[PDB]
């Protein structure tokens, strides 16, 4: 029943696409266009609000609670009668802000006839059914706009955020009680070419900021912050945003990425950690010709101290001398597998060797592997683990996992390593950070070919996810020196940020099994850094150059899986009692969502049983799937032609009768057979079999939780 009255007035402001407070670059300004944006005013519309620096072209951020009234007052000052169309429920057609053929009374258009210079108060409210009061965040944002012309009521700056939070733990302004900050985000594409002033200026301006000139979000530590995931684009455009280092908690779930469309009503909150300079990686492959970068400036203001314990609470440590050895070698790896099965003649007899006199056999494709000792020449085996190929192998993290990535480059370009959303030490980098301070807190990831560097950091209990989600979260890692070119060169893998199921030094995955992933990255040779090892240097036909032709272009545009461009060597034929965790990923040069249809097969996610799923780039999607089926079918997609006609899968799933291990070949055992000695599922130990952990000979301290109490 609270009165949340606001005074918004739209006007045309010649706002530059770059924050230039100094009049030195105004004579040669590369941006000088008008923008009709929303601007808040005082009662009776006297003086203009100063507005935050983050809200360049964004209007006033409206805030409200449940069961309250919102007598918002608007005064248009542009040129055409605009309106305000929120996302409430109590507002009627007389005050809805939508001008269309309603087939009702003509007097219902009084909310849209707001002439430029006429005041009009909208009598709106909200019902009680707009409050979650559960596992959702205490706020439910909304987007209000003008229903006149969406092509103009957005590119000019006619966008504003509306907040309908929960009455109780919220203050006056949109900030919670236990949280001391309110971070509002906005990522838009102001297409100036399609608006009111038809001027050729197709530029990707995030809130009117180009080349990463967006004002940096800054907040000191020892406090709590709250986010607001908002930002509508011109239409079907998305934004692959990510919060490096600092992990948020969207929908009370510890996540670090969010990529939807049309500004989805979602807010989040988290708790800051140590001081530093983190990154807001706005890595949008389809939106990079203009510029969109941001970072995090975490200082240190000593105000309150939490009970955050560093190590686990007197039961879990597992201090082991296990450092992951990674050497950026240039072993001979090609798009086609070693001796292909389905005969990939398009790459075997054209680019794999000296056939057709194109590239050759000796390549420089660098792959991130994992050795077993300090040799930097052979891993667990001489080749690879087959099940991953050029993709990264199996890496698991736990408390004191000693993630000491002994990286020693030896190719022709300085590389590094960076796991997705991991907090490190002020001494070692392992993250594309610009934090260059003193020698004590310096961090440089530049590892020249020949020099070795170890990124030492102790992953502990403050680096684990929640409890309701899956065990090990999928976080694909990639090089931090380069952004888009190293991914095409085969420098990408996957990391398992698991929960608190640390049993021994390796962490026994309780109620789990093996892992089956699925990657589909479409890249090009021109995107990779080793473009010189194709047609110019590593070449044997200087008279005929395979360029400027569609034949050589599509020969590089390929979708790979486990380092195998045609088809993989393994099948998805599981059996019963397979509590595995399926992972999916599909990075590349795209930005929207990617889907895949499953015929005759389904999965389990969200306490239900869906058929198909939809993954997201940047981050990694994980789901615990139990593969129980008898027969064989296809897993094709429904798109155009280069991604729907050859993206099938041939496998046979059979379980006769339990896990099918009495007359076939599979790495499982029901057992259900003659057991006269020792077989599978025979956990008979002399001291004690199992229970929860192995802190002592019997574990005498009784406090096994799943995080900070």
């Amino acid at each position: 029943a609270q009165l949340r009255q606001f005074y918004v007035a739209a006007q045309g402001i010649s706002w530059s696409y770059r924050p230039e407070p100094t009049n030195s670059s105004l004579n040669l300004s590369v941006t000088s266009f008008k923008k009709i944006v929303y601007r808040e005013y005082e009662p009776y519309f006297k003086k203009e609000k100063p507005q935050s620096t983050i809200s360049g072209l964004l209007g006033p951020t409206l805030y409200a609670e449940v069961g309250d009234i919102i007598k918002v007052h608007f005064k248009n000052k542009a040129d055409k009668p605009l309106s305000i169309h929120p996302q409430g429920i109590r507002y009627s057609k007389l005050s809805e802000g939508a001008s269309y053929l309603d087939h009702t009374f003509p007097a219902e258009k009084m909310d849209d006839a707001v002439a430029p210079g006429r005041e009009y108060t909208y009598e709106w409210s909200i019902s009680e059914d707009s409050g979650p009061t559960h596992d959702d965040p205490p706020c439910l944002t909304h987007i209000y706009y003008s229903h006149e012309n969406l092509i103009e009521d957005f590119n000019s700056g006619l966008i504003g955020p509306l907040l309908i939070c929960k009455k109780g733990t919220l203050t006056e302004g949109g900030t919670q009680k236990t949280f001391d900050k309110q971070i509002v985000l906005l990522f838009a594409v102001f297409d100036e070419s399609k608006s009111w002033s038809q001027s050729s200026s197709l530029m990707y301006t995030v809130n009117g900021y180009v080349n990463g000139t967006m004002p940096d979000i800054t907040v000191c530590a020892h406090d709590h912050i709250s986010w607001h995931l908002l930002g509508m684009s011109s239409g079907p455009e998305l934004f692959s945003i990510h919060f490096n280092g600092q992990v948020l908690e969207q929908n009370h779930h510890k996540v670090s990425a969010i990529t939807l469309v049309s500004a989805t009503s979602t807010t989040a909150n988290m708790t800051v950690g140590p001081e530093g300079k983190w990154i807001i990686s706005s890595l949008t492959p389809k939106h990079l010709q203009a510029g969109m970068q941001a970072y995090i400036d975490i200082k240190n203001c000593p105000k309150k101290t939490r009970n955050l314990k560093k190590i686990t609470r007197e039961q879990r440590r597992h201090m082991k001398r296990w450092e992951y050895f990674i050497a950026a070698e240039e072993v001979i790896w090609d798009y086609a597998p070693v001796i292909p099965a389905n005969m990939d003649k398009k790459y075997r007899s054209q680019h794999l060797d000296n056939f057709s006199n194109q590239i050759g056999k000796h390549y420089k494709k660098v792959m991130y592997t994992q050795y077993e000792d300090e040799s930097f020449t052979k891993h667990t085996v001489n080749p690879n683990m087959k099940e991953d190929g050029i993709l990264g192998p199996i890496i698991r993290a736990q408390v004191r996992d000693t993630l000491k990535i002994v990286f020693k480059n030896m190719a022709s370009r300085p590389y590094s390593i960076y796991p997705h959303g991991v907090t490190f030490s002020p001494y070692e980098d392992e993250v594309n950070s610009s934090f260059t301070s003193g020698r004590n807190n310096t961090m440089i990831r530049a590892v020249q070919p020949g020099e070795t560097y170890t990124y030492k950091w102790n992953i502990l209990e403050f680096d684990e996810p929640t409890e309701n989600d899956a065990q090990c979260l999928t976080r694909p890692y990639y090089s931090d020196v380069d952004i888009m070119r190293d991914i095409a060169s085969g420098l990408i893998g996957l990391l398992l940020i698991c929960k608190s199921r640390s049993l021994d030094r390796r962490g026994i995955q309780r109620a789990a099994d093996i892992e089956q992933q699925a990657v589909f990255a479409v890249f090009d040779e021109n995107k990779s850094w080793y473009l010189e090892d194709n047609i110019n240097k590593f070449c044997e036909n200087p008279d005929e150059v395979k360029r400027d032709d569609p034949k050589f272009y599509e020969s590089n545009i390929m979708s790979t899986i486990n380092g195998y461009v045609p088809e993989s060597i393994t099948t998805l034929g599981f059996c019963f009692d397979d509590t595995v965790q399926w992972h999916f990923c599909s990075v590349g040069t795209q930005n929207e969502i990617l889907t895949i249809h499953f015929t005759g097969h389904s999965f389990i996610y969200g306490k239900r049983h869906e058929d198909t799923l939809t993954l997201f780039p940047m981050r990694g999607e994980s789901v615990t799937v139990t593969m129980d089926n008898v027969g064989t079918w296809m897993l094709t997609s429904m798109n155009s032609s280069p991604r729907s006609k050859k993206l099938r899968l041939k496998f046979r799933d059979v379980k006769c009768i339990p896990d099918d291990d009495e007359d076939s070949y599979e790495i499982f055992e029901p057992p259900e057979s003659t057991v006269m000695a020792t077989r599978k599922m025979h956990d008979r130990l002399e001291p004690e079999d199992e229970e929860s952990d192995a802190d002592y000979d019997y574990q005498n301290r009784l406090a096994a939780a799943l995080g900070i109490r």
Partner: protein, 254 residues
């Protein structure tokens, strides 16, 4: 709601009470034929002696000449975990044969084929037992047999801290009321399939029995066919007609 109703004095034979020579019981058994009684292995191992009496609906009282089924010796099991619980099935080697009476009704032998058709259809079940798995403060003098539903396998490994294999699964209500350690240990969780009766569960204690309203632990004898077959044909024909039929066998149940 169907609560803890007692067993009927008609169609409730599967209750071979395993007691001692004195006035002190321990667990129970399962009636199927005249040469083998399915029960838990901890009934005898790490316990006391063994005294069986079939058709005994009451321990303190007696319904006449009906409870008689003495046992000579007994052995153990190969897959029986002494610390935890896994394939906890033991056979009681009786000494005197007993015919088929009213309170002693036989049952057909199970098979591996009734493993994919009995767990997906009959999502319930009954737990026959005098009440010796949770012998704390609910020792009822009457033979009680409540009804418990079946839950998905993905909710049985977390019911207890011990990781449960395929042999044992859920067989109780949700986390609401007391639905575990029901009846005597080795109690038959027979599920009326279709025109026949096949036992498919043995109640045993894991870490004891306390505040276990989550789920229950009950075995699956459909996979136990290779053990009941190796201990019935390799022993040979009954020499002295159920002596031992036949207790003279190795400890890992042959």
């Amino acid at each position: 709601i169907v609560g803890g109703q007692e067993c009927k004095d008609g169609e409730c034979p599967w209750q071979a009470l395993l007691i001692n020579e004195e006035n002190e019981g321990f667990c129970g058994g399962t009636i199927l034929s005249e040469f083998y009684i399915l029960t838990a292995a901890h009934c005898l191992y790490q316990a006391k002696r063994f005294k069986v009496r079939v058709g005994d609906r009451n321990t303190e009282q007696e319904e006449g000449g009906e409870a008689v089924h003495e046992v000579e010796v007994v052995i153990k099991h190969n897959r029986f975990t002494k610390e935890t619980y896994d394939f906890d099935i033991a056979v009681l080697r009786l000494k005197t044969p007993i015919t088929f009476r009213m309170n002693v009704a036989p049952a057909c032998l199970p098979e591996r084929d009734w493993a994919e058709s009995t767990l997906m259809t009959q999502k319930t079940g009954i737990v026959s037992g005098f009440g010796r798995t949770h012998e704390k403060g609910r020792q009822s003098t009457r033979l009680k047999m409540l009804e418990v539903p079946y839950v998905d396998r993905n909710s049985c490994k977390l019911s207890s801290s011990f990781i449960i294999t395929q042999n044992m699964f859920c067989a109780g209500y949700d986390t609401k009321q007391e639905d575990a350690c029901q009846g005597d240990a080795g109690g038959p969780h027979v599920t009326r399939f279709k025109d026949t009766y096949f036992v498919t569960g043995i109640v045993s204690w894991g870490e004891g029995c306390a505040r276990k309203g989550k789920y229950g632990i009950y075995t699956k004898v459909t996979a136990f066919l290779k053990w009941i077959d190796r201990s019935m044909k390799t022993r040979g024909l009954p020499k002295a007609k159920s002596h031992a039929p036949e207790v003279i066998t190795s400890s890992p149940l042959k």
